[PDB]
């Protein structure tokens, strides 16, 4: 059977502006491949097609794309879930970020916000453990749904608030990470972290749009995390 694609193309040294290019790929009738499988094969015919990929198993978070209007990972998005009779499979870069080349976006601002919330254990050193920090299963369970983030940026690049103020609003992913350390029993700088999240932009630009939850390939929920952060901010500054 024949598959038809409409793919976002851009090369600063050639293209005056972005454009959509039509692609065709003969596929095995009774075999369902992933979008990444198709992209790789399309590159075999058109070597100039640029895109990110690596683990091909939905763990590294390299191939985040806007497919048929919705963000996700090409490596775990089956062709059958995109293919519709009469319409082309539309593939575009993640929204909001500067486009370097074709389907490759500059994740600079995404990483910048990640660094702004200081994503690393902050332990004051007092009362050191004999060996490893003792963390009960109950305390450890608080990290579940938070530490699994693969930094694919599917959520942030789908959040309007992040679109309008990518340099001030931390975004879904970044805030999920912030909470990841806020409720880590081993982190001792909760109050300090909160004092750096009290401004009008960092956290409170989130208005429960919930684009983040729907697109997360790992099934995480940034909205709930942000909700918890807001509570902590109130308990401390209200």
């Amino acid at each position: 059977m024949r598959l038809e694609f409409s793919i976002y193309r851009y090369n600063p040294d050639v293209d005056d502006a972005p454009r959509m290019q039509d692609y065709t790929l003969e596929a095995d009738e009774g075999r369902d491949m992933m979008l990444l499988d198709a992209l790789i094969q399309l590159k075999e015919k058109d070597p100039s097609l640029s895109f990110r990929r690596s683990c091909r198993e939905g763990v590294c978070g390299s191939d985040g794309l806007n497919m048929n209007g919705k963000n996700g990972l090409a490596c775990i998005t089956p062709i059958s879930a995109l293919n519709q009779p009469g319409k082309k499979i539309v593939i575009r870069p993640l929204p909001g970020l500067p486009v370097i080349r074709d389907l490759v976006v500059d994740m600079g601002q995404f990483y910048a916000q990640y660094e702004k919330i200081k994503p690393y254990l902050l332990n004051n050193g007092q009362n050191p453990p004999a060996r490893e920090h003792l963390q009960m299963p109950e305390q450890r369970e608080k990290l579940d749904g938070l530490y699994e983030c693969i930094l694919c940026a599917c959520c942030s690049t789908s959040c309007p608030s992040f679109w309008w103020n990518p340099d001030k609003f931390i975004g879904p992913a970044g805030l999920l990470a912030a909470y990841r350390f806020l409720i880590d029993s081993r982190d001792t700088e909760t109050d300090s972290r909160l004092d750096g999240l009290s401004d009008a932009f960092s956290v409170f630009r989130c208005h429960s749009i919930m684009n983040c939850v729907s697109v997360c390939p790992k099934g995480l929920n940034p909205t709930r995390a942000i909700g918890h952060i807001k509570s902590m901010l109130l308990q401390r500054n209200a």
Partner: peptide, 8 residues
């Protein structure tokens, strides 16, 4: 601040 707006 952000918290103050949220409350008001």
């Amino acid at each position: 601040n952000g918290v103050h707006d949220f409350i008001l």
